[PDB]
């Protein structure tokens with residue numbers, strides 16, 4: 001799936017090797033966007049980029065710019081490709097060109113770039129690292145097009161879908177999917193070092209295994225002590241370990257299925273939403289004194305690849321005098337507030353209401369129309385109760 005699979009002007013990279021994206025490809029410049037379909041930032045920025053690549057279809061014109069081709073790597077899947085470039089936070093912009101004497105790459109200082117600045121840059125870079133021909137100029141715009149029109153194929157109906165209704169009940173298969181997705185993808189991208197990260201990871205997984213029994217955390221824990229000097233962490237080995245933990249999610253590893261987190265469209269909600277559910281389920285089901293909020297924050301520190309989001313989250317100040325449950329509830333609501341009016345990159349049919357709504361439970365509100373925390377803390381401990 002990923003973000004650009006409905007857009008022809010952008011080539012989706014499954015691999016680093018450019019010969020196999022086209023014959024001519026290794027001889028042409030590429031502006032590559034690395035992103036994560038779960039990230040607020042990446043979500044929003046994909047607009048711009050699609051728009052930018054949209055301008056790269058011009059047939060016979062003498063713009064140095066028009067010899068470049070736009071491409072995108074999604075780091076929620078293509079973890080291997082991304083690790084190769086030490087990509088961690090996103091989105092991220094790379095200029096690739098042929099090495100004249102596989103490709104040489106150039107890391108963009110600033111990857112958040114307006115459509116023109118993007119153009120102004122790509123242009124500048126092509127001129128700098130290329131010898132700008134006609135023989136070359138037409139050459140690229142050629143394959144550049146065979147890819148465009150060809151990907152246009154891939155994109156009753158091959159479109160027509162239906163009417164959408166948000167599912168508001170909570171289903172384990174969503175919480176589990178979140179856990180699977182986290183271990184399988186997010187842990188994989190970043191690895192187990194340094195030590196502080198491994199620590200974070202162990203503490204989190206252990207806390208999951210204890211709070212949410214038979215979510216298949218046990219299997220994952222085992223995998224986590226398997227790493228040693230002699231058996232160091234590897235994406236291949238690890239992802240294998242996780243699929244065989246028997247985490248009870250729904251769908252295929254490659255494609256997880258959400259229910260409560262299901263959006264009006266595939267590129268909305270999903271993982272980030274499930275991740276929240278899991279975090280709340282943690283606060284409710286924790287054995288006493290594992291710290292939860294302490295642990296959780298520290299997992300988000302080393303495992304959450306959305307940098308805008310991870311940043312102010314690790315700054316929340318959680319005193320463990322009081323109910324983890326309430327506090328995280330507070331925290332998650334503060335976020336909804338922020339994201340409330342934000343139109344860019346959001347699901348049109350699933351708003352950001354302060355949770356729970358009034359229908360959700362009347363018991364939580366009062367005469368005035370504001371929250372009675374004691375009741376809310378009760379409601380959450382029900383809604384998120386984990387029964388196997």
Ligand SMILES: Cc1cc2nc3c(=O)[nH]c(=O)nc-3n(C[C@H](O)[C@H](O)[C@H](O)COP(=O)(O)OP(=O)(O)OC[C@H]3O[C@@H](n4cnc5c(N)ncnc54)[C@H](O)[C@@H]3O)c2cc1C
Pocket residue numbers: 040041260261268269270272273274275276277280300308309310313328329330332333335336339350351352354355356
């Ligand atoms: C820790 C964290 C920090 C994030 N920070 C940002 C950010 O800064 N910017 C950004 O764009 N995205 C951020 N995200 C992603 C974002 O929070 C949303 O999850 C996603 O962008 C859209 O969520 P949604 O509309 O599908 O429902 P979300 O609210 O995210 O999904 C949560 C689900 O859990 C329940 N829920 C909602 N609110 C509460 C609450 N108050 N208490 C208990 N349960 C609740 C509901 O069932 C809801 O459907 C963050 C995600 C996480 C996990």
